[PDB]
Write a protein that binds this ligand. Structure first.
Ligand SMILES: Nc1ncnc2c1ncn2[C@@H]1O[C@H](COP(=O)(O)OP(=O)(O)NP(=O)(O)O)[C@@H](O)[C@H]1O
Ligand SMILES: [Mg+2]
Ligand SMILES: [Zn+2]
Lengths: 394, 244
């Protein structure tokens, strides 16, 4: 079966591996989504099964005569095992973050083992120039492509680092976050110039990227996802895709867990974002400020065991700020919809409140409005609300 | 417009029960009677005086924060008790209510000193009294809330009412909280005040007449409050019918 993978992979022209400690899945999804949005048959372990068996399984179940590109997310610790049977043409690495519970220098050791494993195989390596420990993999191929982010592209929501070439303390001209930044040892190991670079971006509420003098209007959020998008951008370009083809798929990709998850049908738009505590609610209530036009809210408050039976925390949330927004109506739902109605009355939020305790009906009701749906469930409300939203958007 | 002043004691340490919601309920009910409410947060008692106070409020903290709050409040035990004895309106929540009494006994038998304002005690047990609670009061109407406390409080004063669903102060009495003069105390969460507007209006009204300012209009719109109460009333009944 390890010979069957070897046999299956041989008939695939382009095999792209995605690895690193964080962001592999988002990166890999952006790549597979964008190719699929262009009618390119691909093998894609789109479920995150990034170990040898799951990679083997994807190849078995998805390979066809028309499958030109394999897009494979790989657990970094499985790189040696998979390389015995598959050699990729291209490999992108996102980052290498040492966790605080990791033992002494388990990172550089991991990166050496990876560099030794992939060494001298003609693999085109796509490296995060801003991560010193990804950039250390430059020693492992003669075909290196850098991506990175211009200094001051974004103000990220922020221990000490040692050079991976010579081991001396690293000097940084600028820090994006943690170890990600513009560094330069005295040994010569430095932050190299990037072939593809983000000059600036913002999150208002979704990523809006500026890559090599082109603008990408995303439908996912999260600071850190600019890097995953840029990594996916770099794969797609190196596969020969053009700005427009890449832009088409980047503009439609969305998350699927109910966290800043976007929806669209014709001109009607919605966004759903889980909030189950004062800080999560405040952030979900803020999203509407950054959306243009009238908004229609559906907010769900269940009080099941997993939610907690005490709903008093909604008084610690800043529902009063909704008065600064342009809102057609707020539908309150869940087993404790009436606490939400009463909370909003005391918030002096003077828009129509519709009490509809059935989460399904309350959520579908937002389709009756033309404004941007902002949908906010607490924990046990999420699955029914998300399911209705997928129903309503076809 | 008229003003009323709330002394909010130890708002920093005694912060476990979403006190702000009780503050909001008082601000909003008074605002519909054209009364502006100023809240004075009092976390240090040094020569504090009740001359300028219309209603006081003491929230609940953890066992450790309660004892430290009690130690700080004991610096004005006599100005406080004489204010209560003069009819000063007050609301106290969980620990802020329990430490009005003589002592609080933790589950392991540990004995914490209260203010001793009133002659009662509380003794905690590990198995908690938890759930929806529906109370029928002759002063506050139907009081509706959530309870979740290990403390069993034992006093021979008047209470917020009779418990038709839930426990109240302890396992046996089917009576909730304390009502002494204009001082209220309770174990209820929600917080208590937003749904239970007769309690909010009682305190505002007592402070209005003692100050000599009017409380008009007296009857206002309560639909949202009553709809929120009714959820718990209906569910309590269901739990009763489903226990046959
Ligand atoms: N570029 C990034 N930099 C730092 N953190 C990130 C980045 N991308 C994602 N993360 C965080 O990492 C978490 C996991 O993201 P994901 O895309 O699932 O990474 P992954 O590498 O696939 N994880 P795993 O398969 O468990 O090794 C996310 O919830 C983010 O909080
Ligand atoms: Mg993954
Ligand atoms: Zn160096």
């Amino acid at each position: 079966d390890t010979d069957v993978l070897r046999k299956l992979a041989e008939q695939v022209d382009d095999i792209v591996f995605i690895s690193g400690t964080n962001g592999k899945t988002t990166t890999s999804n952006l790549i597979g989504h964008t190719l699929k949005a262009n009618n390119i048959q691909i093998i894609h372990n789109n479920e995150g099964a990034n170990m040898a068996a799951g990679i083997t399984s994807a190849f078995i179940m998805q390979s066809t005569p028309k499958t030109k590109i394999a897009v494979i997310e790989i657990d970094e610790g499985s790189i040696p095992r998979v390389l015995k049977e598959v050699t990729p043409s291209m490999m992108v690495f996102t980052n290498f973050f040492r966790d605080q519970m990791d033992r002494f220098g388990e990172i550089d050791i991991m990166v050496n083992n990876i560099a030794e494993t992939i060494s001298n195989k003609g693999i085109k390596l796509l490296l995060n120039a801003d991560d010193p420990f990804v950039s250390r993999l430059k020693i492992a191929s003669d075909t290196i492509v850098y991506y990175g982010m211009k200094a001051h592209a974004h103000e990220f929501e922020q221990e000490s680092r040692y050079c991976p070439n010579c081991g001396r303390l690293l000097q940084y001209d600028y820090i994006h976050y943690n170890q990600i930044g513009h560094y330069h040892c005295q040994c010569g190991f430095k932050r190299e110039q990037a072939k593809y670079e983000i000059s600036s971006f913002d999150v208002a509420p979704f990523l809006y990227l500026n890559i090599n003098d082109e603008k990408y209007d995303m439908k996912i959020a999260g600071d850190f996802n600019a890097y995953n998008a840029l990594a996916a951008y770099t794969v797609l370009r190196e596969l020969g895709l053009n700005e427009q083809t890449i832009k088409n798929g980047f503009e439609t990709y969305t998350s699927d867990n109910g966290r800043m998850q976007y929806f669209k049908k014709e001109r009607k738009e919605a966004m759903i974002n889980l909030a189950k505590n004062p800080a999560g609610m405040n952030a979900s209530l803020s999203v509407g400020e950054q959306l243009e036009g009238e908004k229609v809210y559906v907010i769900s408050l269940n009080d099941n065991a997993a939610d907690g039976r005490d709903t008093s925390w909604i008084y610690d949330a800043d529902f009063e700020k909704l008065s600064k927004q342009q809102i057609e109506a707020i539908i309150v739902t869940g087993t404790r919809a009436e606490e939400l109605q009463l909370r909003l009355k005391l918030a002096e939020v003077e828009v129509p409140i519709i009490v509809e305790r059935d989460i399904y009906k309350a959520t579908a009701k937002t389709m009756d409005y033309k404004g941007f749906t902002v949908a906010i469930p607490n924990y046990t409300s999420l699955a029914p609300m998300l399911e209705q939203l997928n129903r309503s958007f076809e | 417009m008229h003003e009323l002043t709330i002394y909010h004691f130890m708002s920093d340490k005694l912060n476990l029960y979403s006190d702000i919601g009780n503050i909001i309920a008082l601000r909003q009910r008074a605002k519909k009677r054209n009364i502006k409410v100023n809240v004075v947060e009092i976390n240090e008692t040094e020569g504090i005086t009740f001359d300028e106070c219309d209603i006081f409020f003491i929230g609940g903290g953890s066992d450790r924060e309660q004892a430290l709050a009690t130690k700080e409040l004991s610096k004005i035990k006599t100005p406080l008790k004489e204010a209560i004895e003069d009819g000063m309106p007050g609301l106290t929540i969980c620990g802020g209510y329990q430490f009005l009494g003589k002592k609080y006994i933790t589950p392991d038998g540990t004995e914490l000193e209260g203010l001793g304002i009133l002659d009662f005690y509380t003794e905690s047990k590990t198995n908690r009294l938890t759930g929806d609670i529906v109370i029928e009061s002759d002063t506050f109407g139907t009081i509706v809330g959530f309870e979740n406390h290990g403390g069993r409080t034992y006093h021979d004063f008047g209470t917020l009412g009779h418990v038709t669903f839930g426990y109240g102060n302890n396992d046996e009495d089917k009576k909730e909280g304390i009502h002494y003069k204009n001082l209220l105390g309770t174990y209820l969460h929600g917080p208590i005040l937003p749904k239970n507007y007769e309690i909010t209006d009682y305190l505002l009204e007592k402070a209005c007449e003692r100050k000599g300012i009017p409380f008009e209009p007296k009857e206002i719109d309560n639909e949202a409050e009553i709809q929120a109460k009714q959820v718990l009333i209906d569910r309590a009944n269901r739990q009763k019918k489903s226990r046959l």
